[PDB]
Enzyme design. Structure first.
Site, mmCIF file in Angstrom:
data_model
loop_
_atom_site.group_PDB
_atom_site.id
_atom_site.type_symbol
_atom_site.label_atom_id
_atom_site.label_comp_id
_atom_site.label_asym_id
_atom_site.label_seq_id
_atom_site.Cartn_x
_atom_site.Cartn_y
_atom_site.Cartn_z
ATOM 1 N N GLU A 1 -9.805 2.738 2.064
ATOM 2 C CA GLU A 1 -9.044 3.932 2.488
ATOM 3 C C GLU A 1 -10.004 5.006 2.980
ATOM 4 O O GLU A 1 -10.336 5.965 2.266
ATOM 5 C CB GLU A 1 -8.170 4.454 1.353
ATOM 6 N N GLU B 1 -1.563 -2.969 -0.097
ATOM 7 C CA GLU B 1 -1.165 -2.428 -1.405
ATOM 8 C C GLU B 1 0.256 -1.911 -1.263
ATOM 9 O O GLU B 1 0.578 -1.273 -0.256
ATOM 10 C CB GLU B 1 -2.068 -1.243 -1.870
HETATM 11 O O1 LIG Z 1 8.598 15.832 6.178
HETATM 12 C C1 LIG Z 1 9.552 15.272 5.271
HETATM 13 C C2 LIG Z 1 9.997 13.867 5.750
HETATM 14 O O2 LIG Z 1 10.717 13.929 7.013
HETATM 15 C C3 LIG Z 1 11.185 12.609 7.425
HETATM 16 O O3 LIG Z 1 11.960 12.707 8.630
HETATM 17 C C4 LIG Z 1 9.999 11.681 7.671
HETATM 18 O O4 LIG Z 1 10.467 10.392 8.108
HETATM 19 C C5 LIG Z 1 9.215 11.537 6.378
HETATM 20 O O5 LIG Z 1 8.065 10.684 6.598
HETATM 21 C C6 LIG Z 1 8.781 12.925 5.878
HETATM 22 O O6 LIG Z 1 8.162 12.790 4.593
HETATM 23 C C7 LIG Z 1 6.837 12.740 4.251
HETATM 24 O O7 LIG Z 1 6.211 11.514 4.680
HETATM 25 C C8 LIG Z 1 4.777 11.610 4.562
HETATM 26 C C9 LIG Z 1 4.124 10.307 5.043
HETATM 27 O O8 LIG Z 1 4.657 9.944 6.332
HETATM 28 C C10 LIG Z 1 3.735 9.063 7.030
HETATM 29 O O9 LIG Z 1 3.705 7.743 6.441
HETATM 30 C C11 LIG Z 1 5.014 7.164 6.315
HETATM 31 C C12 LIG Z 1 5.594 6.999 7.699
HETATM 32 O O10 LIG Z 1 6.951 6.516 7.564
HETATM 33 C C13 LIG Z 1 5.568 8.362 8.462
HETATM 34 O O11 LIG Z 1 6.030 8.203 9.810
HETATM 35 C C14 LIG Z 1 4.144 8.915 8.485
HETATM 36 O O12 LIG Z 1 4.093 10.179 9.206
HETATM 37 C C15 LIG Z 1 4.360 11.883 3.096
HETATM 38 O O13 LIG Z 1 2.945 12.110 3.123
HETATM 39 C C16 LIG Z 1 2.340 11.847 1.850
HETATM 40 O O14 LIG Z 1 1.786 13.066 1.314
HETATM 41 C C17 LIG Z 1 1.181 12.845 0.058
HETATM 42 C C18 LIG Z 1 0.725 14.214 -0.478
HETATM 43 O O15 LIG Z 1 -0.130 14.759 0.517
HETATM 44 C C19 LIG Z 1 -0.582 16.097 0.209
HETATM 45 O O16 LIG Z 1 -1.627 16.160 -0.816
HETATM 46 C C20 LIG Z 1 -2.861 15.495 -0.425
HETATM 47 C C21 LIG Z 1 -3.354 16.027 0.939
HETATM 48 O O17 LIG Z 1 -4.553 15.369 1.435
HETATM 49 C C22 LIG Z 1 -2.267 15.834 1.963
HETATM 50 O O18 LIG Z 1 -2.762 16.219 3.272
HETATM 51 C C23 LIG Z 1 -1.104 16.691 1.509
HETATM 52 O O19 LIG Z 1 -0.098 16.650 2.492
HETATM 53 C C24 LIG Z 1 0.025 11.864 0.198
HETATM 54 O O20 LIG Z 1 -0.435 11.682 -1.150
HETATM 55 C C25 LIG Z 1 -1.703 11.091 -1.388
HETATM 56 O O21 LIG Z 1 -1.626 9.656 -1.287
HETATM 57 C C26 LIG Z 1 -2.810 8.971 -1.747
HETATM 58 C C27 LIG Z 1 -2.448 7.512 -1.592
HETATM 59 O O22 LIG Z 1 -2.116 7.364 -0.198
HETATM 60 C C28 LIG Z 1 -2.385 5.971 0.115
HETATM 61 O O23 LIG Z 1 -1.521 5.166 -0.732
HETATM 62 C C29 LIG Z 1 -0.080 5.417 -0.403
HETATM 63 C C30 LIG Z 1 0.235 4.848 1.008
HETATM 64 O O24 LIG Z 1 1.695 5.055 1.306
HETATM 65 C C31 LIG Z 1 -0.663 5.601 2.026
HETATM 66 O O25 LIG Z 1 -0.485 5.042 3.433
HETATM 67 C C32 LIG Z 1 -2.158 5.611 1.603
HETATM 68 O O26 LIG Z 1 -2.876 6.546 2.528
HETATM 69 C C33 LIG Z 1 -3.091 9.315 -3.162
HETATM 70 O O27 LIG Z 1 -4.260 8.646 -3.592
HETATM 71 C C34 LIG Z 1 -3.329 10.836 -3.216
HETATM 72 O O28 LIG Z 1 -3.648 11.210 -4.553
HETATM 73 C C35 LIG Z 1 -2.065 11.525 -2.786
HETATM 74 O O29 LIG Z 1 -2.192 12.992 -2.858
HETATM 75 C C36 LIG Z 1 0.561 10.515 0.757
HETATM 76 O O30 LIG Z 1 -0.511 9.565 0.984
HETATM 77 C C37 LIG Z 1 1.271 10.767 2.064
HETATM 78 O O31 LIG Z 1 1.880 9.524 2.565
HETATM 79 C C38 LIG Z 1 5.087 13.145 2.556
HETATM 80 O O32 LIG Z 1 4.880 13.345 1.160
HETATM 81 C C39 LIG Z 1 6.571 12.994 2.768
HETATM 82 O O33 LIG Z 1 7.214 14.215 2.356
HETATM 83 CA CA LIG Z 2 -4.328 4.485 -4.678
#
Ligand SMILES: OC[C@H]1O[C@@H](O)[C@H](O)[C@@H](O)[C@@H]1O[C@@H]1O[C@H](CO[C@H]2OC[C@@H](O)[C@H](O)[C@H]2O)[C@@H](O[C@@H]2O[C@H](CO[C@H]3OC[C@@H](O)[C@H](O)[C@H]3O)[C@@H](O[C@@H]3O[C@H](CO[C@H]4OC[C@@H](O)[C@H](O)[C@H]4O)[C@@H](O)[C@H](O)[C@H]3O)[C@H](O)[C@H]2O)[C@H](O)[C@H]1O
Ligand SMILES: [Ca+2]
Ligand SMILES: [Ca+2]
Ligand SMILES: [Ca+2]
Length: 349
Positions: free
Chosen positions: A158, A276
């Site tokens: 990652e 994963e």
């Molecule tokens: O905006 C709300 C909602 O609107 C909808 O229309 C939309 O469809 C939704 O996607 C959206 O919700 C949000 O989605 C994102 C992710 O979306 C992306 O991936 C999924 C796709 O379908 C989408 O198109 C993409 O755009 C979520 O994002 C998550 O945020 C958390 C928390 O992040 C915050 O804190 C840490 C900081 O660095 C961030 O910048 C800050 O925003 C992240 O949490 C971290 O995750 C890692 C693990 O991530 C890894 O494992 C999980 C796997 O799914 C991922 O691909 C890997 O990278 C942990 O170790 C950290 O400790 C943790 O903090 C998520 O990784 C991230 O996906 C929004 O939360 C959600 O509201």
């Molecule tokens: Ca992890």
């Protein structure tokens, strides 16, 4: 020692079947350099790995295991890997090969937000570390060269930028660094020749994430051989569902269908895997065998959906830890038999 037989990346992915991550094991880290091998392997509470664990996976409907490995505490100042450590990685690979499984060995908490990570999607870091990274992969590739096509290499886990930005890097130059590492990984492995000339290799997106910008700026490395690269992402989506959802509902399902649709729209000629997935959400809270029954069912339903959708999309999946964990591994027995049963039914029916 089984004879190498070249097989395409899509064939491997099709043959992975149900996969599992041997997590918090060779990837555990933080006790410092120069410790006994077992001190690392058990540092995060997992037992030492056994042959029977790999046999158990194969005998209970799984065909692939991912073996995360963190390397930095096992490298000297010149980047040489401690021999006892490489021999232990080898031993666990052999357990998997003996059991008839596919296995993935990667470079794990050398990336991401932990102390000690040194591979980052950052152009300065890339320039400072590229020779060390290629030297690490040259060593892994040589040490594991003789295993057959059931063994795959994964360049990095990652990778994040210098600010540990999950989801996407703060600056677009971060993608240039990631894409360069990916090319260096392929180059270094291929250069060792032999089976490694055609071994299937796995390259991960930024953060192992799957949003639009991360996919658009992902560049598959150039490879002189055909169809021996696989792309990997990680999915615990919808983020934090285990803490906020009562049931694996249509929002959860639609989130996954949209994710596979996007990945498949992008990767029409290259295979990808979900390396994963699991219930791990905020503060790494996740399911366990003492979770309420409705929460275990939530986990089961997620897993069933993930397995079936991946199969529909000619992908493959690897469960992160929970189904086969800690003290249950030495018995061996499932930690979450109803989750596994849902996965087996989804995959086979
Ligand atoms: O905006 C709300 C909602 O609107 C909808 O229309 C939309 O469809 C939704 O996607 C959206 O919700 C949000 O989605 C994102 C992710 O979306 C992306 O991936 C999924 C796709 O379908 C989408 O198109 C993409 O755009 C979520 O994002 C998550 O945020 C958390 C928390 O992040 C915050 O804190 C840490 C900081 O660095 C961030 O910048 C800050 O925003 C992240 O949490 C971290 O995750 C890692 C693990 O991530 C890894 O494992 C999980 C796997 O799914 C991922 O691909 C890997 O990278 C942990 O170790 C950290 O400790 C943790 O903090 C998520 O990784 C991230 O996906 C929004 O939360 C959600 O509201
Ligand atoms: Ca992890
Ligand atoms: Ca035994
Ligand atoms: Ca198929």
């Amino acid at each position: 020692n089984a004879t190498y037989m070249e097989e395409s990346a899509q064939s491997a992915v099709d043959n992975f079947g149900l996969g599992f991550n041997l997590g918090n094991t060779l990837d555990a880290n933080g006790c410092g350099t120069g410790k006994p091998v077992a001190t690392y392997e058990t540092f995060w509470g997992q037992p030492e790995t056994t042959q029977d664990m790999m046999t158990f996976l194969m005998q209970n409907g799984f065909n692939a295991v991912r073996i995360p490995v963190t390397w930095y505490e096992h490298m000297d100042a010149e980047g040489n890997v401690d021999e006892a450590w490489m021999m232990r990685v080898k031993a666990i690979v052999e357990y998997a090969m003996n059991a008839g499984l596919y296995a993935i060995v990667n470079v794990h908490h050398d990336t991401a937000a932990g102390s000690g990570a040194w591979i980052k999607a950052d152009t300065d870091v890339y320039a400072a570390t590229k020779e060390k990274f290629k030297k690490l992969w040259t060593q892994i590739a040589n040490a594991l060269a003789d295993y057959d096509q059931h063994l795959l290499f994964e360049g990095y886990n990652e990778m994040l930028d210098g600010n540990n930005s999950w989801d996407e890097p703060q600056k677009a130059s971060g993608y240039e660094a990631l894409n360069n590492y990916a090319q260096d990984f392929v180059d270094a492995v291929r250069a060792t020749g032999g089976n490694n000339a055609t071994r299937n290799l796995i390259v991960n997106t930024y953060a192992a994430a799957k949003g639009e910008n991360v996919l658009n700026n992902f560049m598959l490395p150039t490879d002189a051989v055909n169809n021996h690269l696989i792309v990997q992402v990680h999915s615990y989506d919808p983020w934090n569902f285990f803490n906020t959802k009562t049931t694996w509902d249509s929002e959860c399902h639609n989130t996954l269908t949209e994710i596979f649709s996007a990945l498949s729209k992008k990767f029409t000629t290259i295979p990808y895997i979900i390396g994963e997935y699991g219930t791990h959400g905020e503060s790494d809270i996740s399911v366990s065998k003492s979770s309420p029954a409705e929460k275990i069912k939530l986990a089961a339903d997620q897993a069933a959906d993930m397995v079936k959708l991946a199969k529909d999309h000619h992908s493959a999946t690897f469960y992160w830890m929970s189904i086969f964990d800690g003290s249950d591994r030495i018995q061996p027995q499932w930690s979450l038999p109803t989750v596994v049963e849902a996965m087996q039914e989804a995959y086979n029916n």
